[PDB]
Ligand binder design. Structure first.
Ligand SMILES: CC(C)(COP(=O)(O)OP(=O)(O)OC[C@H]1O[C@@H](n2cnc3c(N)ncnc32)[C@H](O)[C@@H]1OP(=O)(O)O)[C@@H](O)C(=O)NCCC(=O)NCCS
Ligand SMILES: CC(C)(COP(=O)(O)OP(=O)(O)OC[C@H]1O[C@@H](n2cnc3c(N)ncnc32)[C@H](O)[C@@H]1OP(=O)(O)O)[C@@H](O)C(=O)NCCC(=O)NCCS
Ligand SMILES: CC(C)(COP(=O)(O)OP(=O)(O)OC[C@H]1O[C@@H](n2cnc3c(N)ncnc32)[C@H](O)[C@@H]1OP(=O)(O)O)[C@@H](O)C(=O)NCCC(=O)NCCS
Ligand SMILES: CC(C)(COP(=O)(O)OP(=O)(O)OC[C@H]1O[C@@H](n2cnc3c(N)ncnc32)[C@H](O)[C@@H]1OP(=O)(O)O)[C@@H](O)C(=O)NCCC(=O)NCCS
Ligand SMILES: CC(C)(COP(=O)(O)OP(=O)(O)OC[C@H]1O[C@@H](n2cnc3c(N)ncnc32)[C@H](O)[C@@H]1OP(=O)(O)O)[C@@H](O)C(=O)NCCC(=O)NCCS
Ligand SMILES: CC(C)(COP(=O)(O)OP(=O)(O)OC[C@H]1O[C@@H](n2cnc3c(N)ncnc32)[C@H](O)[C@@H]1OP(=O)(O)O)[C@@H](O)C(=O)NCCC(=O)NCCS
Lengths: 159, 159, 159, 159, 159, 159
């Protein structure tokens, strides 16, 4: 039996929370696409190419993980790649509303794609990317929250 | 790659919500144990044997689902059955607290068992077993909420 | 156009929160039944007759409010009284889950009965009956939380 | 006894969720104004005139519903129209905070206007307008979520 | 300036979460009473004397912490001890409702006593005493969740 | 024993909710800095100097409160001022997520700074600054929500 899962997000940038979730998804499913949405209208700090390069560095040890950027409808991209499982995180109760909305919308768009949720380790659940960037903008130490090469890119982006 | 998942609960009795979640788990994983906890101290309405018999009737069409009752530590039962994935439902934000507590406890008890969460269909998410029993006690129609043989057993239990 | 609303609860005992909600419902609808469920299996402190007598004293100034005790299915009682609107309170986010479950169940039981929700005044929203009783058991002052005759009955019940 | 209710919102555009709530309000109250706030500072996709025209098409079968655009304080508009009831939706727990804030503010602005809340059908509760627009921008099917003429206008707005 | 804080609870038994909160309160305030409510009607597993003895062992290194059992109204006990600050934990969003209710009730009972809240370390926030006892009843390892002497007493209580 | 607390925020502008929290913090701690973040990237309505002047007027009666504007990392500012306690508000469950994220981030940035939370009076808990500004923009009365001199400045800012 073969599961092809998609882990979609803007990953701007990939964090230690994302790394925990993709590592766990990697262990459970045959193949995982870490799918990075262009999200142009959402004004990312890093370009799609920069985000893809960071995610590849961070997920390199995971054999059955593939990083792909995409600009289309997520449901269309999943269909294209024959994915049948969408994996998303729930850091705390507050994440539930939007995951429920997305999962219901995706149910309409691609009835065969099942959404499943993982709760990140307690080490990473409080991590908000906006707050990490805010701390970085003020020169605060963000090394615990991001992979090494991500910390390096973020600091460079802000210097 | 082979996933053996456990879907544990008291299932007192199995509802259309449980049926939706086990059917979806059945489609995703190689094998699913629908594991019914004795839960003696939690005072179930149906005996363990009655609950196992109902769950077998309701899950009979699902080839790769096995129904087993258990009285021990859930983590010990999973280890015994070489399960590596625990599947649980999240009906709404309110279910998150207890799933987060259980998942963290289970992480300590069996570090290799991953917990994953499914959100039931909008058709069934509002279903509370206590409220279904309350309605049944007052002679109200509960046919939409439970499989046919479960409705039959519940009505008999209450007549 | 004529609205007959039902405001159902265990009212064990009626509080200043209930009084605020029934007073507001009284102002909006043609007629309001303040319907007191027997709720025998839920072990009320006050008998149904005691609860009905307290609610009558407290709602006496409200011309178009009628207090009735009932032991059947709430939906059946509403049908019996030709009620088309069920009014319930939401004190805070935490009350939402159970109101959503009840409203969906009631939708199945009586499709024509509409449930509508009021948020109690900030003066009363934090009031929990269990906590008021707990404070009363320890001789603490509960006069702000209950109508005068209710405070009198509760104190007598506990002396 | 006569209830004039106001159902205020930005309605950008009116959705099947709004239609469900206004239809239910229509059944309960003598008259309903579906009041569309200009909300200029909130940058709507559709002009006020476009939104009013869509809401009129969608609410045409409801005899006692009137659609009006307004740019002033909602409380002032309600006073102007002698409305005594404000109806708003609660899709899930997450909507509670803002409704509680608005209702308290409106209590100060117009003490006689009562706010009352309806929970939309399970068919529509997960619908977020931002997410529907996002799906539409990517060419995904949004026909289940919006009335036919709204789907038509949205698609045209985005082509 | 001198702060005498009270940290009240049933402490049945004291956990590593309680220890974290009392240690932090100890660092901030001049004196802390760790106040153990008899809570007879709430059916504790450990007697008041057993709970007091466990809390004394666990808080012994904290110079300015005093452990006292009490059976009266918490507000009366605080007044008796001239406490002006009540410290309580918030493990997650789900704890907020009851703390808000208690704090408002305590405001009425003793207007000069201020309630203040601490969030436990991420190491301990998921710990539920009921779930720890449930795991202990089934022979599971609970050593990470309770101080050593508490683990010893609990195991003995259950053997 | 000496507590130096910091109460940080954008205070754009200071509200009666902030005044309640700082007054309570003033009563509990030896010294309180009401610290106003420049928050340039968050586009405040009032300049930092305007916000500092308003906060000084409103906190003038509080002997042990000092108002200071700052543009750096909050943790760095606290270290600079030898603060050991950070005080923040929790108006309702909805505020918990962001306070938990901030508190965890601040734990990493300055391990010795303890965060503690106060719940504002029921009089002020529903107050949202964005909604007060929205009401002010439409000429509605906001006098209950802001100190007198703040109402004066806001009205002038909007005329
Ligand atoms: C991109 C897409 C997957 C959303 O992903 P995402 O959650 O926004 O991406 P990320 O996990 O990397 O995080 C994005 C932002 O929202 C936050 N976020 C993510 N999940 C969240 C949740 N469930 N609740 C609240 N915030 C959340 C992120 O943390 C980040 O905020 P931050 O910058 O402060 O960290 C989704 O919109 C998508 O499928 N895009 C393609 C177009 C499409 O198909 N749209 C319709 C899908 S139904
Ligand atoms: C049995 C066990 C899996 C819990 O399962 P469960 O969720 O209670 O079983 P069910 O899904 O059938 O429901 C049980 C009751 O709690 C409710 N419930 C289930 N999940 C819930 C959630 N996350 N939040 C709130 N309520 C929930 C159920 O609906 C039911 O209530 P109801 O009678 O009104 O319907 C768990 O305690 C267990 O693993 N037992 C074995 C012993 C053990 O190992 N304990 C330690 C595990 S960390
Ligand atoms: C009685 C009935 C209306 C529920 O009412 P109720 O909310 O329990 O009655 P009250 O408002 O007086 O409060 C009952 C208890 O639950 C609490 N409560 C009420 N609404 C709540 C909410 N939505 N969320 C959490 N707790 C709530 C009450 O405060 C009280 O607890 P307390 O003793 O600490 O104060 C309902 O079960 C009923 O319709 N009974 C008749 C039988 C029936 O038809 N059942 C099926 C209906 S779908
Ligand atoms: C317009 C007004 C009624 C708010 O209405 P509204 O809820 O924003 O309008 P809609 O229901 O059509 O939705 C507006 C946006 O916020 C969302 N929303 C609506 N209610 C919500 C809730 N309670 N919680 C979270 N989001 C909500 C909507 O879905 C929409 O977001 P989307 O574009 O992703 O769909 C209100 O601000 C108003 O009265 N305006 C007039 C000026 C005024 O009087 N202001 C002070 C009133 S106290
Ligand atoms: C005892 C008293 C302080 C409550 O304390 P407490 O929170 O129940 O005591 P603990 O922190 O040790 O925990 C008690 C139980 O409720 C849980 N709990 C504690 N705080 C909680 C919260 N805010 N939300 C949900 N559950 C909570 C505990 O974890 C424990 O459950 P568990 O056995 O699964 O672990 C309170 O009722 C009191 O002041 N008692 C004296 C009498 C009185 O004055 N009453 C009126 C006070 S307003
Ligand atoms: C400024 C800082 C303290 C945040 O404070 P703040 O909460 O935003 O300031 P205020 O209390 O005056 O309110 C700011 C806005 O967010 C809202 N808000 C405040 N606390 C909130 C909460 N916990 N949840 C949701 N919204 C909240 C405010 O009400 C206001 O919104 P409004 O304009 O509608 O009223 C924080 O970002 C900071 O420390 N800044 C300095 C830079 C830094 O060190 N960053 C990293 C800290 S971990």
């Amino acid at each position: 039996m073969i599961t092809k899962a998609i882990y979609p997000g803007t990953f701007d940038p990939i964090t230690n929370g994302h790394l925990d979730l993709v590592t766990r998804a990697s262990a459970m499913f045959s193949h995982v696409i870490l799918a990075i949405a262009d999200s142009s209208s959402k004004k990312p700090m890093f370009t799609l190419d920069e985000r893809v390069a960071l995610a590849k560095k961070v997920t390199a040890p995971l054999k059955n993980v593939e990083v792909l950027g995409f600009s289309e409808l997520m449901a269309e991209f999943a269909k294209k790649h024959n994915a049948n499982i969408l994996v998303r995180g729930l850091r705390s109760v507050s994440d539930f509303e939007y995951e429920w909305q997305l999962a219901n919308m995706n149910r309409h768009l691609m009835p065969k794609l099942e959404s499943v949720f993982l709760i990140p380790s307690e080490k990473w659940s409080f991590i908000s990317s906006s707050l990490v960037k805010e701390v970085a903008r003020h020169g605060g130490d963000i090394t615990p929250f991001l992979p090494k090469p991500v910390t390096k890119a973020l600091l460079a982006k802000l210097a």
